[PDB]
């Protein structure tokens, strides 16, 4: 009598961490070093937490050993409140803010309390794979709207309107975008709002990279651009403040809310179930959002994030058969590859073949629900030396690669 | 502006250790009233401090734990858990069979999500820890409650279990030592539960998070070694025993023949990587807690505060007219029975609410633990004695002239 996985997991595929790592983990155990450009994890690439965060966590640790409120510490939620109040989200109270074990937990919770069987969620393609998985896990269906590579990976508005059904409950916006690195203009975001307003949709805004911007890139939160709509905004400390392991994220409810009291009680229900998010690291939030922002040094010209993005950009375009749109934010690149030139029918196989030959780990584009096997994603976190070595390996790999 | 209700999967979910009565208490606290909250097993506000050996290990390892770790958790942490259960006769367990989550709560939910399809039944004790019922319902499963026998030291009634087994039953939940009854099950009882699970091919889910909080000559028996031929999942953590609930550190261990449940395990691993990882810094405390000297021994012995508080609370609650209670041999709770007809109790939530409004003390009604009748409630034994009598002498005055 076999015990298979539940039906709610039949479509689920969040695997940036998938069966390719099985061979990667094997190579590592054998002693071979594998350059992992697959995960946006700051610490393995030499990114340390700001001292101020570490100091305040250590200081409050003996006082944070018990359960806190399910929504999180008041002072932390107060800091989050003030942060968004300085962006035009004035009516946000501490009761509109939920702190969880990273944004990941809250994304799932937000969908669990919302979706029923048959319900549809508009999700970008390419996506952040958790969003698709979360919707599916919540018994909803992820309907993918296309992002337009020829338009700097901006969402296709005509595609979004065309894929709206009477079952669409909301639309997911990931801005700045993982994995394209796109930074959406205010004009486009205003178009999304109009669509959401006309079709009675809830806007979910994953803005976890809103402070990782390059050059003249300017982040616009969609929440204060939709003051008359109920919107939910996600952000955290993982990427911007390089403390992914502390698991600290939050979601903020903005807009009219009395028509959504039922949904809110569902969220408060899911938060109460697990009692609370981890407490000691919540004391870091106030220090992170307040005072000096250390991320400014990394994204400015000369900063390692800026230079690594530039270096990966130069090398990936100097490869025959590969092009890419330059990221204006976040930590990723989503290069297009001439699938016909290399006879690529399975982009996962290409990733696997590249791993086995050059010991470098990428993520195939279809893992981000891109309909075609002509893309992949690289992370710009590694040192310039590592990026140069891995991309030259990739160039050598592709020069003699004809997928069988 | 159509109404946004909570999802259908949350319609039959409660977990009311935290809710409307709790909501009232906080209002009272805002309003200038000091309230003695005995609703939750939270050690820290009752003068319980983190084992300083745990603190110094987390502090020292904090700068090295900023990034994502393996989804199942830190290797050294899982190493300790493996060895801990190795010593208790589960000699086949490896690191791959261990999942570290943000407290046991997260793992309980995940374990149900990956297992249960719509209509699938899970045997859950009555009374239960309400998260179990919530997690089953949340996963679209049905929580089928088997009664525990108050006249038999709150032991599960084996006849009631067998009478409620249907072809839809997937597994059975065992909370041992028990929340809320504080019962410590015998090896002979646990052995018969194994026999039941063996005949009907049921997965055993063992919540053994109080396995080290024992009184008198009470001996804990893990059901996993007693069922070496069955798949069993055991839950435990640092929250209660090691008084660091706020750190949110728990683990679940898979034991037995796992080949026939490959799909279910793949589901667990999927849910496991969906959130990337559990909070990493506090995972360095597992090795410290599980090894060397156990500080919990000072609290449980006849000199310890937990032993004493358990005593004085049991004797005080029994002397109250119309109230009786079975003495707990473990955990941190009591589940007193009240003579409903004497006070005309038809709703136990209103009773707890009245006691809160009358005397600023917060309890939890028994129906919050899925007990079918309004003739029970729960007391936590964490407060040191001074507040135990205060609140119980308070509870005595309340009942002396109460009529619902
Ligand atoms: C990295 C990432 C997350 C994960 O956030 P956590 O706070 O670490 O859980 C969520 N969404 C996006 C788009 C991400 O890139
Ligand atoms: C307190 C408790 C939990 C929750 O444990 P955490 O690790 O803090 O999430 C789970 N099960 C039982 C029986 C409990 O008493």
Numbering used by the authors:
A (entry chain B): 2 to 405
B (entry chain A): 1 to 404
How do the authors describe this structure?
At the crossroads of these pathways, several partially overlapping enzyme activities collectively known as glutamic-pyruvic acid transaminases (GPTs) or alanine transaminases (EC 2.6.1.2) participate in functions such as alanine de novo biosynthesis, which is essential for the bacterial cell viability (since both L-alanine and its D isomer are building blocks of the cell wall), and alanine degradation, depending on metabolic and environmental conditions. Alanine transamination in E. coli is catalyzed by at least eleven distinct transaminases, of which the three predominant enzymes are AlaA, AlaC and AvtA.
Here we describe the 2.11-Å resolution crystal structure of full-length AlaA of E. coli in complex with a substrate-mimicking acetate molecule locked into the active site in the binding pocket of the α-carboxylate group of the incoming substrates, alanine and 2-oxoglutarate. Despite the fact that several crystal structures of alanine transaminases have been deposited in the Protein Data Bank (PDB), the structure of AlaA provides the first glimpse of a completely structured bacterial GPT active site poised for catalysis. In addition to the constellation of electrostatic interactions that secures PLP binding through its phosphate moiety (including the side chains of Ser105, Ser239, Arg248 and Tyr68*, and the backbone amides of Val104 and Ser105), the covalent bond with Lys240 induces a strained conformation in PLP that enhances the reactivity of the cofactor and is further sustained by an extended network of polar and apolar interactions. In accord with the requirements for transaminase activity and control of reaction specificity, the acidic carboxylate group of Asp207 keeps the N1 atom of the pyridinium ring in a protonated state through a salt bridge interaction. Secondly, the crystal structure of AlaA and the other alanine aminotransferases possess an N-terminal segment with two distinct portions, a proximal, generally folded structure that participates in the dimerization interface and stretches over the top surface of the active site; and a distal U-shaped loop that we have termed the plug, 7–10 residues in length, including Tyr15, Ile17 and Arg18, which ends in a rigidly fixed Pro anchor residue followed by a helix.
